[PDB]
Design a protein around this ligand. Structure first.
Ligand SMILES: COc1ccc(S(=O)(=O)Nc2ccc(N(CC(=O)O)S(=O)(=O)c3ccc(OC)cc3)c3ccccc23)cc1
Ligand code: NA
Ligand code: NA
Ligand code: NA
Length: 285
């Protein structure tokens, strides 16, 4: 009975919503709002708790990048503040290794970060780790074999098809094979020993293409495309299928949730979000 949690996001302004989808019964729960609205954040789970990391509050009253880390306990339906990151990071990527949260890249105003930092929930402290080899905002992150992959993004000048791999024990990054497509604001996840990158923006158009990196072969291969082009989408994996949530298609904030079945190489529409939004954080617990 694990749920897909969606936190924050944007429609007209940054949002405070926390909602959870159950693929088993098709239900949505409306859970406790975030304390502060944010879009461009990332979600992750450590030890059955949901963490909302970074992002930005884009409001009619002003725009504020976030260094916040907040923790949601499903058992109490309550958000609790944690230690903030060293710097604000909007359009952040996040991955977890061995119970530690990595905050990768993102922007603070015009600064497009190459820096990376690591949170230890048991000490409630962040520290810097090695910087990525490239500045990346709108970067997607996934973890496989206790290595962390940072995929695509924007460096402040160029939208990127490159990607790189972090080695936590050695504390170093290495460039991996570049993707077939330039993608910022893609959904990036791990499924069956491959890193998937779904959708995003190539500098000109929102994308419906999906490609996956087979780590063993160092090769990116396209799979079936999504039905809807989308950037700033949420993504996650639940019971061996990919779910993509919302995003912007170039004209509309989407409420569409599509599900990828690797066995048949097919996408299908599985539910709608309660309202269209982009820039959400997503995780499963
Ligand atoms: C036209 O030029 C571009 C088009 C698309 C892109 S991208 O999708 O690749 N990168 C992203 C852009 C914006 C984000 N958000 C808000 C912000 O950072 O200011 S959002 O989801 O909150 C949002 C707000 C307003 C929007 O209007 C249409 C669209 C998205 C992003 C949030 C997370 C990840 C990437 C984001 C970049 C440039
Ligand atoms: Na610190
Ligand atoms: Na993720
Ligand atoms: Na609706």
């Amino acid at each position: 009975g694990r749920l897909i949690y969606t936190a924050g996001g944007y429609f007209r302004q940054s949002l405070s919503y926390l909602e959870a989808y159950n693929p088993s019964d098709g239900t949505w729960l409306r859970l406790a709002d975030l304390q502060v609205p944010r879009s461009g954040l990332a979600g992750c789970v450590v030890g059955g708790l949901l963490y909302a990391v970074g992002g930005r509050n884009n409001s009619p009253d002003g725009n504020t990048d976030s260094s916040a880390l907040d923790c949601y306990n499903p058992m109490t339906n309550q958000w609790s503040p944690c230690a903030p990151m060293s710097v604000p990071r909007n359009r952040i990527g996040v991955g977890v290794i061995d119970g530690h949260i990595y905050a990768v890249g993102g922007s603070h105003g015009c600064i497009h970060h190459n820096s990376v930092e690591r949170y230890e929930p048991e000490r409630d402290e962040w520290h810097l780790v090695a910087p990525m080899l490239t500045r990346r905002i709108g970067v997607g992150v996934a973890v496989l074999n206790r290595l962390l992959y940072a995929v695509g993004g924007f460096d402040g000048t160029n939208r990127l098809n490159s990607a790189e791999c972090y080695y936590p024990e050695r504390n170093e990054w290495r460039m991996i094979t570049a993707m077939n497509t330039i993608r910022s604001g893609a959904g990036v996840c791990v499924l069956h020993n491959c890193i998937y990158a779904a959708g995003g923006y190539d500098g000109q158009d929102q994308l419906n293409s999906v490609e996956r990196y087979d780590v063993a072969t160092a090769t990116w291969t396209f799979v079936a495309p999504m039905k809807h082009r989308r950037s700033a989408l949420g993504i996650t994996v639940h019971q061996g299928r990919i779910y993509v949530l919302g995003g912007y298609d170039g004209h509309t904030f989407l409420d569409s949730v599509e599900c990828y079945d690797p066995d048949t190489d097919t996408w299908s529409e599985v539910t709608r979000m309660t309202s269209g939004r982009s820039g959400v954080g997503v995780a499963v617990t």
